[PDB]
Design an enzyme around this catalytic site. Structure first.
Site, short mmCIF file in Angstrom:
data_model
loop_
_atom_site.label_atom_id
_atom_site.label_comp_id
_atom_site.label_asym_id
_atom_site.label_seq_id
_atom_site.Cartn_x
_atom_site.Cartn_y
_atom_site.Cartn_z
N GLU A 66 6.31 6.45 -71.07
CA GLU A 66 5.56 7.60 -71.55
C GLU A 66 5.96 8.81 -70.71
O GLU A 66 6.99 8.80 -70.03
CB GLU A 66 4.06 7.34 -71.41
CG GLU A 66 3.19 8.21 -72.29
CD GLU A 66 3.46 7.99 -73.76
OE1 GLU A 66 3.35 6.83 -74.21
OE2 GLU A 66 3.77 8.97 -74.46
N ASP A 114 12.87 15.35 -56.80
CA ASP A 114 11.81 14.44 -57.22
C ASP A 114 12.24 13.01 -57.01
O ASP A 114 12.08 12.14 -57.88
CB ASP A 114 11.43 14.69 -58.68
CG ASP A 114 10.07 14.08 -59.04
OD1 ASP A 114 9.29 13.74 -58.13
OD2 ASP A 114 9.78 13.95 -60.24
#
Ligand SMILES: C[C@H](C(=O)/N=C1\C=C(C2CC2)N=N1)c1ccc(N2CCNC2=O)cc1
Lengths: 258, 302
Positions: B16, B131
């Protein structure tokens, strides 16, 4: 001096040769001209000032526009739409927080709809094959600035000013690589502000001698001298601000004694 | 566009996210297995998401065995699909699945080695990942590990400014960022990698902060509160407080007990406080810790 400094430079020199638009694309355009382009970029400079956008953004948008026009015929009435989409894409790529599309539709005086702006964004991305990370004069100047032992803010501002002016005139700047325009703008600003010349460290780094920059340097000088008489004034105004040490007010040397 | 999408057979949803949904899929004509990242362009009616703009443009410039590969981009009218190579697992689920036994040292060495290679490629191509966390690192059955999720990546031909909303999760956030530095630098990715290296070795997160301040204190408590001698300019940083507790540096052999001299040396250099002094990926690859690196295959429980 960063650890990947040289690698990034070598690489930017490689990419600038690929993201290079067709020098003579304007003659092959049936409805737009250098003059119309100048009016467009000058406008984008104002838009950039209106939304307090980074200079890199302005540079990226111009690179997109020239690449797009290098392969797509565009009519007078659509030239601004392309420019708007370009600026929007550039803002999305470079800015931390880009302006909303409504703002880009606003700055066109409802000439185009939100719908048309988004469709043009799509078309521009297709035509550029999502290759938006293009090398700019701005980037190269940044790389060059780290070879300025006597870190001078005036020199930088002036260099930035000279580099930004080159964006306005397709003729003769389209025929120069971003790294060369930056080399010329750096030397000119350094010379004008300190009387110093294109540093040995940069000669070793870029491989460019003062002799190699001459052709571009000569044009950039003339653009500097004529700057006050140019039909487009947004960049000069912008560089009157104390943020840039009002370098647009600095008088260009009479000659370069090259 | 619509034809290309027809050539794909959806296998199953594998993830997701904000950008959208990711599916494992198969090319009907070639049989190639892929991962399809789907982006609904009607959820914001703001054009193509900035995040996608950057991930696509930067990723298609980064072709390296240790960087997830972007195979294609299909831009329909209302949808945007990014097609990637498919990999079986991510490092976070692997660490979790290896809790009982612990990822073997040679494999940890191999993964670090490969991660540094992918990161070096990024950096020498003016791209900051920003990240790096276990979850964004993909691994396959052959023993390869690759950097993924460039949703926050940025080109740094020109300085990249710090932004409160777009930042890596707390646990892997570098001290400069926490102390409010103005600009990002390649050093933040090395720091993240260092935290990951330690986590693999010990089986526990190195600095599991509950908040920004707690994150800093956990770092301070392990590495010692930095002073002007250790990090010139630190006491002048925007979020530095003279009221910060003064902790002494814990002995490294007690922080990462299973590591040898070389390992401790490499990790400490990846966790140097001064970003200008923090080892680069390029130099880390030359460290003697990687003297005998090999390419073991993981035990992928699937
Ligand atoms: C971690 C791994 C994964 O995300 N792999 C990727 C992601 C990419 C691109 C987006 C960049 N390429 N490989 C995964 C996660 C869930 C499943 N799942 C969940 C249920 N069944 C199943 O098969 C399968 C693989």
């Amino acid at each position: 001096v960063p650890d990947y400094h040289e690698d990034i430079h070598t690489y930017l020199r490689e990419m600038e040769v690929k993201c290079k638009p067709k020098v003579g694309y304007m003659k092959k355009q049936p409805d737009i001209t250098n003059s119309m382009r100048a009016i467009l970029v000058d406008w984008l400079v104002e838009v950039g000032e209106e939304y307090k956008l980074q200079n890199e953004t302005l540079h990226l948008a111009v690179n997109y526009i020239d690449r797009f026009l290098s392969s797509m015929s565009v009519l007078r009435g659509k030239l601004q739409l392309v420019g708007t989409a370009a600026m929007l894409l550039a803002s999305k790529f470079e800015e931390i927080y880009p302006p909303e599309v409504a703002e880009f539709v606003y700055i066109t005086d409802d000439t185009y709809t939100k719908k048309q702006v988004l469709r043009m964004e799509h078309l521009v991305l297709k035509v550029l094959t999502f290759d938006l990370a293009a090398p700019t004069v701005n980037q190269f100047l940044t790389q060059y600035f780290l070879h300025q032992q006597p870190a001078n803010c005036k020199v930088e501002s002036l260099a930035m000013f000279l580099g930004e002016l080159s964006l306005i005139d397709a003729d003769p700047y389209l025929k120069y690589l971003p790294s060369v325009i930056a080399g010329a703008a750096f030397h000119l600003a350094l010379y004008t502000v300190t009387g110093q010349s294109w540093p040995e460290s940069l000669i070793r780094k870029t491989g460019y001698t003062l002799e190699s920059l001459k052709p571009c340097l000569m044009d950039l000088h003339q653009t500097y001298l004529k700057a006050p008489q140019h039909a487009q004034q947004s960049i000069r105004e912008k560089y009157k601000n104390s943020k840039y040490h009002g370098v647009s007010l600095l008088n260009p040397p009479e000659t370069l004694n090259l | 566009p619509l034809v290309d999408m027809e050539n794909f057979q959806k296998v199953e949803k594998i993830g997701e996210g904000t950008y959208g949904v990711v599916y494992k899929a198969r090319n009907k004509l070639t049989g190639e297995v892929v991962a399809l990242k789907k982006i609904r362009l009607d959820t914001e009616t703001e054009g193509v998401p900035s995040t996608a703009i950057r991930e696509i443009s930067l990723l298609k410039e980064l072709n390296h065995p240790n960087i997830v590969k972007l195979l294609d981009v299909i831009h329909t009218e209302n949808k945007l699909y990014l097609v990637f190579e498919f990999l079986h697992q991510d490092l976070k689920k692997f660490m979790d699945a290896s809790a009982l036994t612990g990822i073997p040292l040679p494999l940890i060495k191999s993964y670090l080695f490969q991660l540094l290679q992918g990161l070096a490629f990024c950096h020498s191509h003016r791209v900051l990942h920003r990240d790096l966390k276990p979850q964004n690192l993909l691994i396959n059955t052959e023993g390869a590990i690759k950097l993924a999720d460039f949703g926050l990546a940025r080109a740094f031909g020109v300085p990249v400014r710090t932004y409160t909303h777009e930042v890596v999760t707390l646990w892997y956030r570098a001290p400069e960022i926490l102390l409010g530095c103005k600009y990002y630098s390649t050093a933040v990715d090395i720091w993240s990698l260092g935290c990951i290296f330690a986590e693999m070795v010990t089986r526990r997160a190195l600095f599991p902060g509950d908040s920004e301040i707690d994150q800093l204190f956990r770092i301070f408590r392990t590495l010692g509160t930095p002073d002007e001698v250790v990090w010139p300019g630190v006491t002048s940083m925007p979020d530095y407080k003279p009221s910060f507790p003064k902790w002494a540096r814990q002995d490294f052999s007690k922080v990462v007990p299973p590591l040898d001299e070389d390992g401790r040396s490499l990790l400490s250099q990846m966790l140097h406080y001064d970003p200008n002094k923090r080892i680069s990926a390029k130099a880390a690859l030359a460290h003697p810790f990687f003297q005998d690196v090999t390419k073991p295959v993981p035990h992928l429980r699937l």
